[PDB]
Amino acid sequence: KPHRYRPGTVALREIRRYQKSTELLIRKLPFQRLVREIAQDFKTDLRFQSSAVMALQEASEAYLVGLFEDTNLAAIHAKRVTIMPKDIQLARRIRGE
Amino acid sequence: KPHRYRPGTVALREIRRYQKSTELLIRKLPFQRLVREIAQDFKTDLRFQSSAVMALQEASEAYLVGLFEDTNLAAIHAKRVTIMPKDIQLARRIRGE
Amino acid sequence: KRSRKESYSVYVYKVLKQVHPDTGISSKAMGIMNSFVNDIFERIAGEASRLAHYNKRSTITSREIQTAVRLLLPGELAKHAVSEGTKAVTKYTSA
Amino acid sequence: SGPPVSELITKAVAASKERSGVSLAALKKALAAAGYDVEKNNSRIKLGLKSLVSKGTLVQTKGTGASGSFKLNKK
Amino acid sequence: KVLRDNIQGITKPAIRRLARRGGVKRISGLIYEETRGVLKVFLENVIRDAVTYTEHAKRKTVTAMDVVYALKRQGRTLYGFGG
Amino acid sequence: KVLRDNIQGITKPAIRRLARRGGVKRISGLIYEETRGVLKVFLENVIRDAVTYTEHAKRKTVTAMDVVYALKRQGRTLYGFGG
DNA sequence: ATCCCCTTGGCGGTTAAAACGCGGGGGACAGCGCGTACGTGCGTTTAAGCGGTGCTAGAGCTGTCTACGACCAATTGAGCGGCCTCGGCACCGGGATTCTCCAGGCGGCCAGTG
DNA sequence: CACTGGCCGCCTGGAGAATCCCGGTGCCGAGGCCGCTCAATTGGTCGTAGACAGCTCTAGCACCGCTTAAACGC
């Protein structure tokens, strides 16, 4: 029998390893393509620093980390280990959007 | 037998009556006593303008009613209509205090 | 050449060697510290401005910024900063 | 050792006889009053509930499976 | 001159009426005392800030302007008293 | 020339790592699309501020300086790139 | 008006990024009652509300004065730019420990029986 | 009704593997050295804002007499 771990244990291993991780968690190039995509939705033929791609990358991931730690607080308040979209929606509502 | 309404509809009558009203629900004199007491806890023999007491009264009014509408959001999150103080602790945490 | 682009690298390095002579520093951490210096400095400067105009004061003095520190810095961090700044200004006025 | 716990379940559900079925709260506190480690034997009372519902000596009032509330059968 | 127990000055029916304005239907019994506590800590922040404003002014009476100003620097600005 | 979908380039497994940082242990399938949606909303607000800076800078290339400026205005001040 | 540099544009190799299917397996959730706990209906009381009275603390304005601090020319010096070496660490190779999940026993318990 | 037997659910044990845990290496950012120049300071000046006395008056504070609304309670 090939060895298999129970669900959540690999998830919790990912939790521990990536709270331990400090690097950027997103592929760089599609994020660059996406910020350029939203840029030409606003102004034409617009250019970016690579440092600006880094900055939006790290700000975006940290902001999402804020939304998801609020999501765990909401979900354990909702007595769920499986989150739903309404957790994130309520977090956006309370955060002062 | 004297007439008696079911538990809840008198509460909703109070609800509807009070968003149609504007009146400051906190009694003036014990609020002034409380603000003098808390101020005396820090710095002594401290006097309050009546305008200051009143202004702080709608301030505290709005702060707590914002907290209660937020905890009603937390309660309908929790499939509940009776809020419990962990809703308030949640709201304090995810608002960021 | 290039124009001199200003940063707080040397002084944080000085206090670093002052309080931990054996430790090192990285470039990312130094950028974080420069952003921290800028952030706390601008918060205190903004609150000092608000105290200046609320009292219609044309100047921000040690009383103004000291009060602003009690506003911004909480609790024991605030009183320790008051102690440090008071010791510093007494040493400064001692020339 | 002693007698099997299913007999305790049957006497606990026959002691009350409400017009509706008895849920698990009153059953587990009836076993607590009679004397039983209800905290450590959740699986044992679950298999007891499955055995008594499945064999047909007892009928479920309104719930489904071990969920819900239970009453006595017609005879 | 000294006051001891003004946390109970904000009465239980006052708390119930507060939660009526916030749209709360049912209010459990544990709510009143800890809501007194969180109102207390909110006023500790607001009054500490405002009283700090007053002692900055070398004034001795707390003014409504300092209450709304200490509100506004906490991101809680109020309309209706000179802000 | 133009691009029509790079929102999905912030992929489903990438969103899974991001929520693994937040401590989220089980994620249903419905969350991910709304996360990219609110990602679009936030980054749309930030880049609106940023291009408004950039057009006010009378330049055509975005720097990280106006990025951290816009993060300052929105209230999510970023350390590491100031100055 | 320019200049020069980091982004833009284009190119080749690769392996992790992803990605999708299988399958186990962890999960939300209605619901059926039960515990109970405020919600609401009154009575009671008492203190807040209202009205009136005397005091004065300090809020706030005015005058005085002086304490204090930007500006500026100048001198200089210590940190910014720039280059340059070097070992802590970035990456690499081999071994324990968690850990954890899985294999075989212990025990409770249900089930049959003299 | 006790005695005995067998199977589900925990009890006990144990081995593979991810990540930590012992060295090995080479390197490039980090610590350090040098030119300098832009900026840090110094003294004098000007000029100005605010700290403080006085004062005054006014609104806040101290006190009292009713009255049911509100608080308290069951």
Q: State whether residue C69 sits within 8 Å of chain E by CB.
A: no
* Integer CA distances (angstroms), E11 to B21, B26, B71, F35, F50, in order: 20, 8, 20, 44, 50
* Contact predicate D27/D12, CB 8 Å: yes
DSSP state of C13: H
Token readout for A3 is: 């060895």
Q: Which residues of B touch A (CB under 8 A)?
A: 70, 73-74, 77-78, 86-87, 90-91, 93-95
Judge whether E54 and C70 are in contact, CB under 8 Å.
no
User: B touches A (3+ CB pairs < 8 Å)?
Assistant: yes
- Cβ atoms of F24 and A71 within 8 Å: the answer is yes
Instruction: Please check whether residue E78 is in contact with residue E64, taking contact to mean a CB–CB distance below 8 angstroms.
Output: no
Q: Residue B45 burial by CB count (10 A; 0-12/13-18/19+): exposed, middle or buried?
A: exposed
Domains in chain D, number: 1
For G42, nearest residue by CA–C1' is B2
Partners of residue A82 on adjacent β-strands: F26
Closest by CA to B49, choosing from E4, E74, E59, is E59
Q: Give me the residue from C50, C64, C70 closest to E73, CB to CB.
A: C50
- Residue matched to tokens 């944080």: C12
Search chain B and give the residue with CA nearest A96.
Answer: B95
List all nucleotides in chain H with at least one atom under 7 A from a protein Cβ: 8-10, 16-20, 29-31, 38-39, 48-52, 59-62, 70-72
State the residue range of the domain holding D2: 1-75
Q: Return the partners of chain F (3 or more C-beta pairs < 8 Å).
A: A, C
Rounded CA separation E11/E18 (Å) = 11
Report the distance separating Cα D47 and Cα D41, nearest Å.
Answer: 10
Interatomic CA–C1' length for residue B28 and nucleotide G52, angstroms: 20
Contact status, residue F14 vs residue A26, Cβ threshold 8 Å: yes
β-pair partners for F26:
A82
d(CA F57, CA D64): 69
Q: How far apart are CA B87 and CA E19, in angstroms?
A: 13
Q: How far apart are CA F62 and CA F55, in angstroms?
A: 9
Task: Say how far D31 CA is from H3 C1', in Å.
Answer: 27
Distance between CA F52 and CA F54 in Å, rounded?
5
> First CA to last CA across chain D, in angstroms?
30
Residue nearest to nucleotide G28 (CA to C1'): A80
Please give the angle made by the CA atoms of B90, B91 and B92, to the nearest 5 degrees: 90
Contact criterion met (CB < 8 Å) for E21 and B61 = yes
Rounded CA gap, A52 and A64, in Å? Answer: 18
- Of C6, C28, C35, Cβ closest to residue F82: C35
Residues in chain B with CB shorter than 8 Å from the CB of E47 are 35, 38-39, 42, 56
Answer whether A77 sits within 8 Å of B93, measured CB to CB: no
Instruction: Write the DSSP string, E28-60.
Output: -TTHHHHHHHHHHHHHHHHHHHHHHHHHHTT-S
**CA dist., res. D10 & res. D27, Å (int):** 10
Domains with residue ranges and CATH for chain C = 1-95 (1.10.20.10)
Cα C3 to chain center, whole Å?
25
The DSSP-derived string for B34-94 is HHHHHHHHHSSS-EE-HHHHHHHHHHHHHHHHHHHHHHHHHHHHTT-SEE-HHHHHHHHHH
Residues F19, A69 contacting (CB under 8 angstroms): no
- Most C CBs within 10 Å, among E73, E74, E81, to test the C interface: E73
User: Distance between CA F75 and CA F83 in Å, rounded?
Assistant: 18
Taken in order C51, C52, C57, C62, the sign of the CA dihedral is positive
> Does E73 contact C63 at a Cβ distance shorter than 8 Å?
no
Q: How many residues does chain A have?
A: 97
Domain range list for chain A: 1-97
How distant is C1' of H72 from CA of B33, in Å?
A: 20
Token code pair at residue B14: 């109070």
In this complex, which residue's CA is closest to the C1' atom of nucleotide G23? A4
Closest CA to E32 of E6, E13, E5: E13
Tokens of A97: 């959007």
| Distance of alpha carbon B39 from alpha carbon E48, whole angstroms | 8
Q: Do residues C60 and C51 lie in contact, with contact meaning Cβ atoms separated by under 8 Å?
A: yes
Reading the block at residue A4, the tokens are: 């298999």
Hey, CA dihedral for E58, E64, E67, E72, is it positive or negative? negative
Q: Which CATH superfamily groups domain F1-83?
A: Histone, subunit A (1.10.20.10)
Distance from CA of A92 to the nearest CA of F (A): 9
Return the residue of A nearest to B95 by Cα.
A95
* Length C18 CA → H74 C1' (Å): 70
Chain A nearest-CA distance from F9, in A, is 5
Cα separation, F4 vs E67, in Å, equals: 52
Cα separation, A11 vs F25, in Å, equals 6
Residues 6+ apart with CB under 8 A from D63: D21, D69, D70
CA atom of B52 to C1′ atom of G63, Å: 31
Please name the amino acid found at residue E44: E
Question: How many angstroms separate the CA atoms of D41 and F16, rounded?
Answer: 38
Q: Do chains F and A touch (3 or more CB pairs under 8 A)?
A: yes
Question: Could you tell me if C19 and C7 are in contact, meaning their C-beta atoms sit under 8 angstroms apart?
Answer: no
- Where in chain E are the domains? 1-83
Experimental resolution (Å): 5.1
CA angle A30/A34/A40 to nearest 5° reads 140
Q: Is the dihedral of CA E17, E20, E26, E31 positive or negative?
A: negative
Report, in angstroms and rounded to the nearest whole number, the Rg of chain C calculated over CA atoms: 16
C26 touches chain F (CB under 8 A): no
- Angstrom CA distances, B61 to B10, B24, B54, B67, F36, stand at 22, 7, 10, 10, 37
F-chain residues within 8 Å CB-CB of A48? 61-62
Q: Could you tell me if C69 and C44 are in contact, meaning their C-beta atoms sit under 8 angstroms apart?
A: yes
* Rounded Cα gap, residues A53 and A56, in angstroms: 5
Gap between the Cα atoms of D21 and D61, Å rounded: 5
Q: Hey, is B96 helix, strand or coil?
A: coil
Nucleotide nearest to A26 (CA to C1'): G17
Residue C15 phi, psi (nearest 5) = -70, -30
- Residue recorded with tokens 């969180």: E38
Q: Which of B35, B52, B67 lies closest to E43 in CB terms?
A: B35
Residue E68's nearest CA partner among E51, E59, E52, E81 is E81
Residues of F engaging C, defined by a Cβ cutoff of 8 Å: 68, 77-83
Name which of A30, E49, D17 is nearest C70 in CA terms. Answer: E49
* Residues contacting residue F48 through CB under 8 Å, at least 6 positions apart: A42
How many H helices and E strands in chain C? 4, 0
Q: How far is B2 from chain E (nearest CA, A)?
A: 24
DSSP assignment string, D5-53: HHHHHHHHHHHH--SS-B-HHHHHHHHHHH---TTT-HHHHHHHHHHHH
Q: Which of F68, B38, B62, F62 is nearest to C39 (CA)?
A: F68
Phi and psi at E62, nearest 5°, equal -70, 135
Q: Estimate in Å the CA F29 to C1' G19 gap, whole number.
A: 15
